[PDB]
Amino acid sequence: DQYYRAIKKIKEAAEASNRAYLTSSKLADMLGISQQSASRIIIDLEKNGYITRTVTKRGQILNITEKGLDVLYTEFADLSRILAIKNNVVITGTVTSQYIIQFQEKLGIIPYLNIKVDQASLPELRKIRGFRGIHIEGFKTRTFGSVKAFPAKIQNIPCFVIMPERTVYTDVIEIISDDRVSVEVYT
Amino acid sequence: DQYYRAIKKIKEAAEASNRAYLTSSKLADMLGISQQSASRIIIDLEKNGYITRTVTKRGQILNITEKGLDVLYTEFADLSRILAIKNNVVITGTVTSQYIIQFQEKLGIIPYLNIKVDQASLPELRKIRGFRGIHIEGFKTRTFGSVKAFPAKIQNIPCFVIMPERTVYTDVIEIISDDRVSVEVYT
**Any residues with CB less than 8 A from the CB of A152 and at least 6 apart, and which?**
A158, A159, A160, A161, A175, A183, A184, A185, A186
Least Cα distance to A41 among A3, A90, A13 occurs for A3
A33 SS3 class: coil
Give Cα separations from B167 to B69, B163, B170, B185 (angstroms): 12, 7, 9, 17
Q: Tell me the binding residues of B for FMN.
A: 167, 174
| No. of helices (H) and no. of strands (E), chain A | 6, 12
Domains of chain B: 1-84 (1.10.10.10), 85-187 (2.40.30.30)
Query: Residue A30 and residue A17: Cα distance in Å, rounded?
Result: 18
For the sheet with A51-56, list strands across it.
A19-21, A59-64, A51-56
Query: Residue A11 and residue A70: Cα distance in Å, rounded?
Result: 12
Query: Residue A19 and residue A17: Cα distance in Å, rounded?
Result: 6
Q: How is chain B split among helix, strand and coil, in percent rounded to 5?
A: 40, 30, 30
Confirm if A97 and A116 have CB atoms less than 8 A apart. no
Confirm if B158 and B184 have CB atoms less than 8 A apart. no
Backbone angles phi, psi at B134, to 5 degrees: -85, 120
Query: Which technique was the structure solved with, according to the deposited record?
Result: X-ray
Query: Residue B117 and residue B171: Cα distance in Å, rounded?
Result: 5
Amino acid at position B173, single letter: I
Least Cα distance to A163 among A154, A172, A155, B4 occurs for A172
Chain A environment of B83 (Cβ under 8 Å): 11, 72-73, 76, 123, 127
Q: Which long-range contacts (CB under 8 A, 24 or more apart) does B62-65 make?
A: B62/B10, B62/B19, B62/B20, B62/B22, B62/B27, B63/B14, B63/B18, B63/B19, B63/B20, B64/B7, B64/B10, B64/B11, B64/B14, B64/B18, B64/B19
Q: Which of B1, B16, B75 sits opposite A79 (nearest CB)?
A: B75
CA B122 to chain CA centroid, Å, is 10
Q: Which of B1, B5, B76 sits opposite A85 (nearest CB)?
A: B76
Give the CB-side neighbour count of residue B33, counting CA atoms within 13 A.
17
Which residue numbers of B have CB closer than 8 Å to A's CBs?
1-2, 4-5, 8, 11-12, 16, 72-73, 75-76, 78-80, 82-85, 87, 123, 127
Confirm if A84 and B11 have CB atoms less than 8 A apart. no
Query: Residue B94 and residue B172: Cα distance in Å, rounded?
Result: 10
Q: What is the CA radius of gyration of chain A?
A: 19
Task: Give the closest-approach CA distance of A122 to chain B in angstroms.
Answer: 12
Chain B environment of A2 (Cβ under 8 Å): 1
Least Cα distance to B182 among B68, B110, B61, B89 occurs for B89
Least Cα distance to B53 among B75, B84, B21 occurs for B21
Comparing alpha-carbon positions, the chain B residue that sits nearest to A80 is B76
Resolution to 1 decimal, in Å?
A: 2.2
User: Within 10 A of B161 (CB to CB), how many other CB atoms are there?
Assistant: 24
Least Cα distance to B67 among B52, B85, B86 occurs for B52
Would you call B79 and A75 a contact, using CB atoms and an 8 Å cutoff?
yes
Comparing alpha-carbon positions, the chain B residue that sits nearest to A74 is B79
Comparing alpha-carbon positions, the chain A residue that sits nearest to B4 is A1
Give Cα separations from B151 to A39, A43, B94, B133 (angstroms): 41, 42, 19, 8
Q: Tell me the binding residues of B.
A: 114, 167, 174
Would you call B84 and A5 a contact, using CB atoms and an 8 Å cutoff?
no
Sign of torsion over alpha carbons A22, A26, A28, A29 = negative
Query: Residue A27 and residue A24: Cα distance in Å, rounded?
Result: 5
| DSSP codes joined into one string, A90-142 | EEEEEE---HHHHHHHHH-S----EEEE-GGGHHHHHHHHHS--EEE--EE--
Give Cα separations from A142 to A86, A122, A139 (angstroms): 37, 32, 8
Query: Residue B100 and residue B103: Cα distance in Å, rounded?
Result: 5
Partners of residue B153 on adjacent β-strands: B158, B184
**Any residues with CB less than 8 A from the CB of B136 and at least 6 apart, and which?**
B99, B102, B103, B106, B146, B147, B148, B149
A164 SS3 class: strand
